[PDB]
From TrEMBL, chains A, B:
It is found in: Apical cell membrane. Disulfide-linked heterodimer composed of the catalytic light subunit SLC7A9 and the heavy subunit SLC3A1. The heterodimer is the minimal functional unit. Assembles in non-covalently linked heterotetramers (dimers of heterodimers) and higher order oligomers; the oligomerization is mediated by SLC3A1 likely to prevent degradation in the endoplasmic reticulum and facilitate heteromer trafficking to the plasma membrane. Disulfide-linked heterodimer composed of the catalytic light subunit SLC7A13 and the heavy subunit SLC3A1. The chain holds residues 343 to 391 of 685 of the full protein. This is Amino acid transporter heavy chain SLC3A1.
Length: 49, 49
């Protein structure tokens, strides 16, 4: 896996609108006060930006 | 220009959040009714999706 540059298999263009769609589904349950639904993701090992 | 595959010079990852930032700047002026500010872009010649 380390012998290639992975520009076509990781972080494609429309990837962030799928993750933003998961956040909207979890917003239908986080409206009542005191029951906010947390959403966290794991970080990219290679980049911090 | 047609002898290359343009994957590093067109439609990069963070491009749509810049265009969505232009839309927020134009929202400070489109609040009063009857003075909505229109925003249109030119289409990609090659793709429709």
């Amino acid at each position: 896996y380390s012998q290639l540059h992975h520009d076509f298999t990781t972080t494609q263009v429309g990837m962030h609108d799928i993750v933003r769609s998961f956040r909207q589904t979890m917003n239908q349950y986080s409206r009542e006060p005191g029951r906010y639904r947390f959403m966290g993701t794991e970080a990219h090992g290679e980049s911090i930006t």
